[PDB]
């Protein structure tokens, strides 16, 4: 099938979106990734050039963004009608790679409507695991073998009535993940595969 020619393609975005906590990050020493509307804009401080990571039309909005410690991957959580997803874009290529939550049949136990935070593991593990702290429908942190399987290897329940919004990996210990939220602070170390 011949793809329909794009009638119009975005050129520049006038404005910025700050509703995502920790949504402003340094992709490099000159490019900064920030949420703007439904497109994640990497803005260059020199030429003001904006590179727009665009999600699929099947989703509603953007909840949170995380960047791998090596800054090679950008994982964005998408708030959708029923199934939130995690879209990981390759900064080097600037192309969408894969999405988490598409096969959420096994995770239907969690009524996650959005991911409040995204955490990449250490630089030596960033490319093999990625964790998503879910909000507005259950604080669920899911271990995803995103690089190869893209499957949830484990589920961490942080409480049904916890306003949890931030998740990250311990710099000294990638086996440990720290999650912060309203009246919630957890630190989980994966021991013997759990």
């Amino acid at each position: 099938m011949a793809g329909l020619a794009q009638h119009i393609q975005l050129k520049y975005i006038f404005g910025m979106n700050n509703e995502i906590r920790n949504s402003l990050q340094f992709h490099d020493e000159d490019r900064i990734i920030y949420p703007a509307g439904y497109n994640v804009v990497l803005h260059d401080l020199n030429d003001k050039s904006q590179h727009y990571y665009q999600g699929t039309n099947e989703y509603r909005g953007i909840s949170c963004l995380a960047l791998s410690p090596l800054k090679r991957y950008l994982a964005l959580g998408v708030k959708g009608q029923r199934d939130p997803a995690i879209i990981i874009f390759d900064t080097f290529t600037q192309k969408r790679r894969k999405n988490l939550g598409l096969n959420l049949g096994n995770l239907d136990r969690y009524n996650i409507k959005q991911w409040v935070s995204i955490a990449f593991p250490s630089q030596n593990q960033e490319t093999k695991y990625i964790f998503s702290l879910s909000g507005a429908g259950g604080d669920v942190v899911l271990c995803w073998w995103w690089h190869e399987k893209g499957k949830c290897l484990g589920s961490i329940d942080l409480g049904a009535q916890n306003d949890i919004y931030e998740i990250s990996f311990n710099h000294s210990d990638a086996n440990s993940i720290c999650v912060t939220g309203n009246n919630f602070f957890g630190i989980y170390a994966k021991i013997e595969g759990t």
Binding site: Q9, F14, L24, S168
Partner: protein, 533 residues
């Protein structure tokens, strides 16, 4: 299970709002931040250790009493914490102070650097070089501050003179754009939003030209074809202003060169393609009369006074020749009033070439094909209503093309080969712009993600069809270049491809600039010749 895991953590801190957690690589430390302003210290294992005495809540006398940490970014020798009132605390990791391994060694207020009144930090980030700190505030603006490496000798907390705060982007709209317009001779995006700021955006240069601050919010604005005047009529009066790039302190520059009063509830202002007239929807008590005022004279003839709209008018369109004005609104009635005096005199009441009323449909966006043959309107019914403009008989029914999402506004490129529509629907939050291959075929269209869940409010297409500008409720202005060569009208072929490069400058503005130059030269020479004795 629900059992708590933070051992030794204080009971009061257990019920405290943890805003952020950072990992200091110095000693694998974990720095937690509470909404109360307390910074919790923990080892690499996360067990509670203490709240450093230099935490914001204990050493900062906030105007509100309690300072809230919003975001923190950890660097090699410590971490930077953001607290309300535009406050930033740099907690450096000092080996000598074991009881307080991280101590606030430098504090600065972003308010003292930028004239931002009561703006709080939304996100704080640092680059790899640890030289530039980016702070995204609640005003949709990101400011970069250069923070020098922490030197133990330079313990000066008030060493803010070495920091420069610059806005990475322009003065982007912080709220939904009330109305949109663009001119033909200049690449100007005239946007009126709830923030009481009317902003002109050079999309070709992707910059802000004029930012007018008004004590009264702007509802709808229209740009004259010459690009020199803007009718930005407010709820109390239609204000025609001259777009002067030189926006000096004088509030008179925001004053309209022509104020027409009393004008009430003007929600749709559109200048005719020729610029000779501008139609504004004067929201009368019950009539919602769309009145055309001559741009150069500001007069509204009674015969040009158009009436019949039972409800709010939501969209106005002008024919290629401007021979007729098309109006749609929440009333669900599309009225095409012919400005021709001969046509108007034929009937006692305001004659309407196309008078259609689809009950149950609230028209939101109206567009006309460049040939002035098809009027395409989109409302809440999820139907594109196409009306064939026939002068012989007034249009009574519209061809309704079904859609899966409501459209808030419509536009036609000069070629008419495509029909662009803004997306404003609450069904699916995907904010995008949808282009049909006009004429609208059997469900053949292409979507492009443009705005957020708030949808597309206003849309316009450049005369050359090179670009489409869409303004949504998110405060972002969207520019999409049309790749459809067939859909791009080759109107710029005959020399006029270049937008007018002249700007309106008052004699007063020029004299002020010259006086400023003279004063600057006088001051410079006085300083040069001033004795140091």
């Amino acid at each position: 299970e629900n059992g708590n895991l933070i051992s030794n953590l204080p009971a009061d801190i257990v019920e405290k709002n943890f805003v952020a957690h950072l990992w200091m690589q110095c000693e694998s430390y974990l720095v937690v931040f509470v909404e109360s302003g307390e910074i919790i210290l923990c080892d690499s294992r996360g067990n509670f250790l203490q709240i450093m005495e230099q935490s914001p809540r204990y050493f900062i006398v906030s105007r509100s009493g309690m300072i809230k940490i919003v975001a923190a970014v950890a660097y090699s020798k410590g971490f930077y914490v953001a607290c309300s009132e535009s406050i930033v605390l740099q907690y450096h990791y000092t080996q000598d102070n074991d009881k307080n391994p991280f101590t606030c060694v430098n504090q600065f207020k972003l308010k003292q650097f930028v004239e931002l009144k009561e703006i709080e930090i939304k996100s704080i980030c640092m680059n790899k070089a640890e030289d530039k700190l980016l702070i995204g505030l609640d005003n949709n603006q990101i400011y970069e501050i250069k923070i020098k490496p922490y030197h133990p000798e330079t313990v000066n907390n008030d060493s803010s003179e070495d920091r420069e705060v610059t806005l990475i982007n322009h003065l982007n709209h912080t709220g939904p754009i009330n109305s949109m317009d663009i001119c033909k001779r200049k690449p100007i995006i005239a946007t009126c939003s709830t923030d009481k700021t009317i902003k002109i955006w050079d999309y070709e240069k992707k910059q802000i030209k004029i930012s007018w601050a008004f004590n009264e919010e702007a509802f709808c604005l229209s740009l004259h074809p010459q690009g020199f005047c803007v009718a930005v009529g407010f709820l109390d009066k239609l204000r025609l202003m001259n777009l002067c790039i030189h926006n000096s302190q004088n509030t008179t520059k925001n004053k309209a060169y022509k104020e027409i009063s009393p004008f009430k509830g003007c929600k749709e202002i559109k200048f005719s393609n020729g610029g000779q007239y501008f139609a504004a929807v004067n929201s009368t008590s019950s009539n919602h009369v769309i009145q055309v005022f001559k741009f150069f004279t500001g007069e509204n003839p009674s015969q040009l006074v158009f009436k019949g709209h039972t409800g709010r008018v939501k969209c106005i369109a002008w024919s290629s020749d401007d021979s007729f004005l098309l109006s749609c609104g929440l009333d669900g009635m599309i009225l095409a009033w012919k400005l021709d005096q001969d046509f108007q005199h034929q009937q006692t009441i305001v004659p309407r070439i196309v008078d259609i009323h689809n009950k149950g449909v609230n028209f939101s966006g109206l567009t006309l094909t460049v040939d002035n043959k098809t009027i395409v309107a989109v409302g809440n019914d999820r139907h594109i209503h196409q009306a064939v403009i026939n002068e012989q008989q007034p249009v009574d029914k519209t061809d309704k093309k079904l859609l899966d999402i409501n459209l808030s506004c419509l536009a036609f490129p000069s070629s008419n080969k495509l029909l662009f529509a803004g997306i404003q629907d609450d069904a699916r939050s995907s904010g995008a712009i949808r282009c049909f291959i006009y004429p609208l075929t059997h469900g053949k269209f292409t979507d492009y993600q443009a705005h957020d869940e708030r949808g597309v409010e206003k849309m316009k297409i450049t005369n050359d069809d090179r670009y489409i500008i869409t303004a949504g409720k998110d405060g972002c202005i969207m520019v999409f270049e049309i790749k459809d060569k067939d859909a791009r009208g080759m109107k710029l072929k005959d020399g006029y491809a270049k937008y007018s490069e002249e700007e309106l400058i008052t004699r007063s503005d020029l004299d002020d600039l010259k006086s400023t130059r003279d004063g600057l030269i006088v001051q410079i020479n006085e300083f040069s010749n001033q004795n140091a004795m």
